[PDB]
Design a binder for this molecule. Structure first.
Ligand SMILES: O=C(O)[C@@H](O)[C@@H](O)[C@H](O)[C@H](O)CO
Length: 300
């Protein structure tokens, strides 16, 4: 019937990735729930803008939605808790934290300090370090140039481990690797696949150094303009999308390693104890006082 608005939703994954399918599902559900009054347009591959630029856009009123996680720590320090190295044990553990009182505090700080509102969370597979030569322990890094996302805690940890990390937008990584500006990066298998890093990296080192969740978010200024009924529809659509997305994540766990191996990547077993000990020390040396007690709890 009527179409009142179109929400623009940007993310960094490609069209086969769980996040994209979930974003599309969110849009379908929201359209149904609002009789088409609210449409969603999904922009994959950072085509709407790079993550940090989208967060700024949401604050300014030019972007409606994005999928964002621990890069929010640049505004809301508690958001670093989404992705503390070696802190979370499993999907079930992260679900408990993200949905519990600590998760509520994180959500509220993101709303207040970043002016974006989490409406769903997606748990992720573990991040792994990719490289041009095998990296079996921190001692192998030896100053290796690598990319991290715009996450100060990751700069701190990877520098302490012996690498030379540089923050960069996700969509810049492939070309930077191709051109030899960096030799490695780190991400879950789903994103290594999404961005075709198999074409520019030889090794997946099984560091499994971060298990994290990420948020589907809406600009607080967009949320504020919605009627209570439409707010409810947004939440309902997001919950449906979250349930759907978890299934897609689980499917990806069964397939992505095999896929990447079929594209020539070599998976490398690491000295997990050495990585974990060095990374936990680095986290504790660099963690904000605000979240230190929670991190110590997780590490206990
Ligand atoms: O490497 C990346 O850019 C991605 O994995 C992001 O999802 C990243 O985790 C961001 O920091 C999330 O806010």
């Amino acid at each position: 019937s009527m179409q009142e608005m179109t929400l623009k939703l940007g993310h960094l994954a490609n069209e086969q990735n769980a996040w994209h399918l979930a974003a599309v599902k969110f849009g379908e559900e929201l359209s149904t729930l609002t009789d088409g009054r609210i449409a969603v347009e999904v922009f994959p591959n950072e085509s709407l803008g790079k993550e940090i630029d989208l967060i700024n856009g949401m604050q300014l009123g030019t972007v409606d939605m994005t999928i964002t996680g621990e890069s929010l720590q640049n505004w809301a320090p508690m958001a670093a808790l989404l992705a503390v190295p070696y802190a979370y044990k499993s999907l079930e553990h992260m679900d408990e934290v993200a949905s519990g009182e600590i998760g509520e505090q994180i959500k509220q700080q993101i709303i207040e300090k970043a002016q974006v509102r989490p409406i769903a969370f997606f748990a992720r597979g573990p991040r792994n370090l990719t490289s041009q030569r095998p990296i079996t322990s921190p001692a192998d890094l030896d100053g290796m140039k690598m990319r991290v996302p715009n996450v100060p805690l990751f700069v701190d940890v990877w520098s302490a481990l012996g690498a030379s990390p540089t923050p960069m937008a996700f969509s810049e990584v492939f070309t930077s690797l191709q051109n030899g500006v960096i030799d490695g990066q780190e991400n879950p298998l789903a994103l290594i696949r999404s961005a075709n890093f198999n074409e520019v990296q030889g090794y997946v080192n099984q560091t499994e150094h971060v298990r994290s969740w990420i948020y589907l978010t809406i600009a607080e200024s967009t949320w504020a303009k919605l009627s209570e009924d439409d707010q409810n529809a947004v939440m309902q659509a997001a919950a449906t999308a979250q349930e759907y997305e978890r299934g897609l994540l689980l499917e990806s766990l069964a397939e992505d390693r095999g896929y990447l191996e079929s594209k020539g990547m070599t998976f490398v077993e690491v000295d997990g104890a050495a990585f974990q000990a060095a990374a936990k020390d680095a986290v504790l040396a660099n963690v904000s006082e605000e979240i230190r007690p929670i991190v110590e709890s997780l590490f206990s």
